[PDB]
Design a protein around this ligand. Sequence first.
Ligand code: 902
Length: 297
Amino acid sequence: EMEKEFEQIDKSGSWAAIYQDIRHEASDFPCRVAKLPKNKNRNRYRDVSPFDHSRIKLHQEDNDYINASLIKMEEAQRSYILTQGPLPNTCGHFWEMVWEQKSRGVVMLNRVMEKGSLKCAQYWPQKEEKEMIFEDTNLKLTLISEDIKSYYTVRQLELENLTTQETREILHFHYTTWPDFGVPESPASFLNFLFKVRESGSLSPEHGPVVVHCSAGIGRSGTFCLADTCLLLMDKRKDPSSVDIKKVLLDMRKFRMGLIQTADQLRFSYLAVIEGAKFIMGDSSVQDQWKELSHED
Ligand SMILES: O=C(O)COc1c(-c2nn[nH]n2)sc(-c2cccc(NC3CCN(S(=O)(=O)Cc4ccccc4)CC3)c2)c1Br
């Protein structure tokens, strides 16, 4: 049981050992397409690639490659697409994926610039009056509105297939205070954000998988999905004791490498899930409490 295991690990200060064990047991599948010479400029990080078996394929005869993985959690019955922060030359590909996969929401866990470097291209319009057109994939993107909070922003975007003139509303959930290789300020601020994404309906099975990304698409992105999947599993069975966090993380890693980067991000996952369990099991006060502690106002 997670809570007992958590204290058992904290007591013996063995998170590093526990975390390394996961790395040692993680699935190792080929990433041949990602390593093809022609795709070199489509990858942000040389050592972070999507496995061939679970990679998202763009629907274009030219090059169907994009650094993005479909994490399909069979038992939990929820899917996510984890991808790297789009590059100046892959923003059109990024949105093409969102369209073809019928995604309703996009979760961004990083900032365009962090530690003085560009960890993600400016792939969405910052001003209503200046919409964006991706000529290579023939898509139009317009900012419709945005709700700015203290540590996160929610934007309503309109994505249009210039080819068919069809349009869709895309919700953009932007967590702006989660440091690279770091953890959220507190379980409360993280859960407050997750529940926001959840309440939008973006994770519903009626929609395509939500797109989740940070810079590499595995650290913060992995932490986010692991916590959400664990809470979902627990929610399906209304039994917090039935969830094996490490086991779920390993199953997730069968679809994309390196999910969760530091021992602390893993430790934070336990923290978020344990606290989230309160809501799952009937506590209708914790949500408001998280909102308070988050200081989003
Ligand atoms: O979001 C965050 O918190 C941080 O975001 C990241 C970065 C960032 N910089 N600036 N902003 N964000 S860089 C980065 C990175 C790039 C290249 C290699 C890395 N390290 C590797 C460590 C070992 N593995 S592995 O998957 O364990 C290898 C493996 C594969 C299969 C089976 C067993 C083992 C791959 C990643 C890690 C991450 Br993640």
